[PDB]
A paper describes a structure:
We first explored whether a previously reported bispecific single-domain antibody [name] could resist the immune escape of the [name]-[name]-2 Omicron variants by neutralization and binding activities. Analysis of mutational events across [name]-[name]-2 variants revealed that the n3130v domain of [name] contributed to its exquisite neutralizing breadth. This domain was found to recognize a cryptic region located in the spike trimeric interface. In summary, our study defined a highly conserved epitope on the trimeric interface of viral spikes that enables broad antibody recognition of [name]-[name]-2 variants including the Omicron subvariants BQ.1.1 and [name], and emphasized a unique mechanism for antibody neutralization via inducing [name]-[name]-2 spike trimer decay and disassembly.
Numbering used by the authors:
A (entry chain C): 1 to 119
B (entry chain A): 35 to 77, 86 to 150, 163 to 185, 194 to 254, 268 to 683, 696 to 706
Write the structure that this text describes.
């Protein structure tokens, strides 16, 4: 009965900056961790970054390790993803997801996704 | 010389007393109906030193003590210990030591070796493993423990190998701790004649052994032979029914196993939280996070015997096998009245106004009585707990609100009137008290596991990286059997899109340096075995889906198969169907009645010689 709405997206240029949002209304679980996923043409879906709900642990992928940044603000219960230095292989559909740390690897919820198109 | 070894060479896998069971084991065995070596003696030998790979199975039917010795050694020159089983009459012993065995393995006074070296464990077993009649001995060695067998049994009239079934009884196995790569046999000569050296080879293949209540093995299936005996072990029985069944990928057996679980060696000081000098109170606790460690849960119970060590979610005994990512540790002290109250789902005063576990919590609580630690005659008021608050809370909601309890009707704000008290109730501890009020220090370990590379796993060791061969991988708990390949996949897809109701692991993330380990099935080919029942005869057929009667041989890896199964995967008497290719039948142009529904309207029967036929489902 919860949802993960997103905002922000469109045609961008290489070597720029972009801000993606992930908000929720009926979601109040604190221990549930948040994550981002990317779907690119040709392949399926690839994990981007993950913020644990137990503490302040943040983890990134192998290619976006020292490029992007994430911030999970619990004051208004929203996640922000700041992507800087956009390369060529970044045009994809980004989706926000939430999953419980204790359990299987499958995500508990999905999002609407935004299309990041790098010129 | 190549002969056929039909159902002979079965030994006992383990030294237990299982009765009326159907135990399926995976050790080194001899495949049935396989080619072996048979040589004779002339008067020096008939064959050079045969390579001892895993084990050896020797057969002999002669008498008068002609072949009563066996040589085991890597190089027999400046190497480890060597096994020397010399069968004698007055001083028959097994002298296991390092010798200088020459190229001539002649028994007949000890001219087999030249000199001796430092020795090891030597057995003084006086019982000799010596006794027409056929003598069969299985020699093997695993985990530094040499195992011997012997099934000397009266044989029938002269032949090459007798029929029937036999099970070599377990002999006196002995721990040595060496490796053997060469094997020879000693021979006795009167005047310084012929013999019968029957040597085979043991491969690490699965084996189904059925036991009896009397204490003997009745029959056993090789599970690595013709489709009938191949499918016989997939159902865990010794008889089949008329119909078509599926296989379990037991044709190509995984030779080796890879684990590669950890990547570091530094220990973890998680015990530093348990033996802390001063702990924290339930009102204000502290959660310590640990990552990139090596967890060793075996040293947890090295302290004094605890109480209520219930670990929900995982197995308390099986803790050094599953990996995680983060280890959270929060420790506090409660009263003895709530030793069992702290539990997942169990409500109460601490489940409402204090710490509480969520619905799904893989971590474990561990508590110990600390009455002799925290006890003051005047009163231990330093340790308190929040009891008076507004309403209920959620898990992981540590509150440090140091304000006056104001859930009443009027704002006391200091005077502490009606419905106004202190949140942190300071209950004291004293030595002269009952067991129900003794303080118990409890730590709540949390094993957080995310979709991230492994950071802290069990204390198990590592294995070797084997590629381009059907092996068994257990990298991060994804225990599977397959082949690891290096594909061009730049990223590892997360198999969670369609919830993966029925989907195997296509690839795994290498715990070592960044690599792409794509998982490929060794040999599946869509193999289906049509067994008409062992009660009728011993003739079956094969079916392969997704082929064109020409791609099936190169898909099921016909080159790496048993010679008996190669003929059932040829291009002769094949038929192209709308669901694959049928091999091992005769397509009749007419049909009478559907008996065995092969698939896609095709039905088979078994009539006369008696063989499998092929027809359609006519209505």
């Amino acid at each position: 009965e919860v949802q993960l709405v997103e905002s922000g997206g469109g045609l961008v240029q290489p070597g720029g900056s972009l801000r993606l949002s992930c908000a929720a209304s009926d979601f109040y679980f604190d221990y549930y961790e948040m994550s981002w996923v990317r779907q690119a043409p040709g392949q399926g879906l690839e994990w981007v970054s993950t913020i644990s709900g137990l503490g302040g642990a943040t983890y990134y992928a192998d290619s976006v390790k020292g490029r992007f940044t994430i911030s999970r603000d619990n004051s208004k219960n929203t996640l922000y993803l700041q992507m800087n230095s956009l390369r060529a292989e970044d045009t994809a559909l980004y989706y926000c997801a939430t999953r419980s740390p204790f359990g299987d690897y499958a995500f508990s919820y999905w999002g609407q996704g935004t299309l990041v198109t790098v010129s | 010389s190549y002969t056929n070894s039909f159902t002979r060479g079965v030994y006992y896998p383990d030294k237990v007393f299982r009765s009326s069971v159907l135990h399926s084991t995976q050790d080194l065995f001899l495949p049935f109906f396989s080619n072996v070596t048979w040589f004779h003696a002339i008067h020096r030998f008939d064959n050079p030193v045969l390579p001892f790979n895993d084990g050896v199975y020797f057969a002999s039917t002669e008498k008068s003590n002609i072949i009563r010795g066996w040589i085991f050694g890597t190089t027999l020159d400046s190497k480890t210990q060597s096994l020397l089983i010399v069968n004698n009459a007055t001083n028959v012993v097994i002298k296991v030591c390092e010798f200088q065995f020459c190229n001539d393995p002649f028994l007949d006074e000890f001219r087999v070796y030249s000199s001796a070296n430092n020795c090891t464990f030597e057995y003084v077993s006086q019982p000799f493993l010596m006794d027409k009649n056929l003598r069969e001995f299985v020699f093997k060695n695993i985990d530094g423990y040499f195992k011997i067998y012997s099934k000397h049994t009266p044989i029938n009239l002269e032949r090459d190998l007798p029929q029937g079934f036999s099970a070599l009884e377990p002999l006196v196995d002995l721990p040595i701790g060496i490796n053997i790569t060469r094997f020879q046999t000693l021979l006795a000569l009167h005047r310084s004649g012929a013999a019968a050296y029957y040597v085979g080879y043991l491969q690490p293949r699965t084996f189904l052994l059925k036991y009896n209540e009397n204490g003997t093995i009745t029959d056993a299936v090789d599970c690595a032979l013709d489709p009938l005996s191949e499918t016989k072990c997939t159902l865990k029985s010794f008889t089949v029914e008329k119909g078509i069944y599926q296989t379990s990928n037991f044709r190509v057996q995984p030779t080796e196993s890879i684990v590669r679980f950890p990547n570091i060696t530094n220990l973890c000081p998680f015990h530093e939280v348990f033996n802390a000098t001063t702990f924290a109170s339930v009102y204000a606790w502290n959660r310590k996070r640990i990552s990139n460690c090596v967890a060793d849960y075996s040293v947890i119970y090295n302290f004094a015997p605890f109480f209520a060590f219930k670990c929900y979610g995982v197995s308390p005994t099986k803790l050094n096998d599953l990996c995680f990512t983060n280890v959270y540790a929060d420790s506090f002290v409660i009263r003895g009245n709530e030793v069992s109250q702290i539990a997942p789902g169990q409500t109460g005063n601490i489940a409402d106004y204090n710490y509480k576990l969520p619905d799904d919590f893989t971590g474990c609580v561990i508590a110990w009585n600390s009455n002799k630690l925290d006890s003051k005659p005047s009163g231990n008021y330093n340790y308190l707990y929040r009891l008076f608050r507004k309403s209920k809370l959620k898990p992981f909601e540590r509150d440090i609100s140091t304000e006056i309890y104001q859930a009443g009707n009027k704002p006391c704000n200091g005077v502490a009137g009606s419905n106004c008290y202190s949140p942190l109730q300071s209950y004291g501890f004293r030595p002269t008290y009952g067991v129900g009020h003794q303080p118990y220090r409890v730590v709540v370990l949390s094993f957080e596991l995310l979709h991230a590379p492994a950071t802290v796993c069990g204390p198990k060791k590592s294995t070797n990286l084997v590629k381009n061969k059907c092996v068994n991988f257990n990298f991060n708990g994804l225990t599977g059997t397959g082949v690891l390949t290096e594909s061009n996949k730049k990223f590892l897809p997360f198999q969670q899109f369609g919830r993966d109701i029925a989907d195997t692991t296509d690839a795994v993330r290498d715990p070592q340096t960044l690599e792409i380990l794509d998982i490929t099935p060794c040999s599946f080919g869509g193999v289906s075995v049509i067994t008409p029942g062992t009660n009728t005869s011993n003739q079956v057929a094969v079916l392969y889906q997704g082929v064109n009667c020409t791609e099936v041989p190169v898909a099921i890896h016909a080159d790496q198969l048993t010679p008996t199964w190669r003929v059932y995967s040829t291009g002769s008497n094949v038929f192209q169907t709308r669901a694959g290719c049928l091999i091992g039948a005769e397509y009749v142009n007419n049909s009478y009645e559907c008996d065995i529904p092969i698939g896609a309207g095709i039905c088979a029967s078994y009539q006369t010689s008696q063989s499998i036929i092929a027809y359609t489902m006519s209505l």
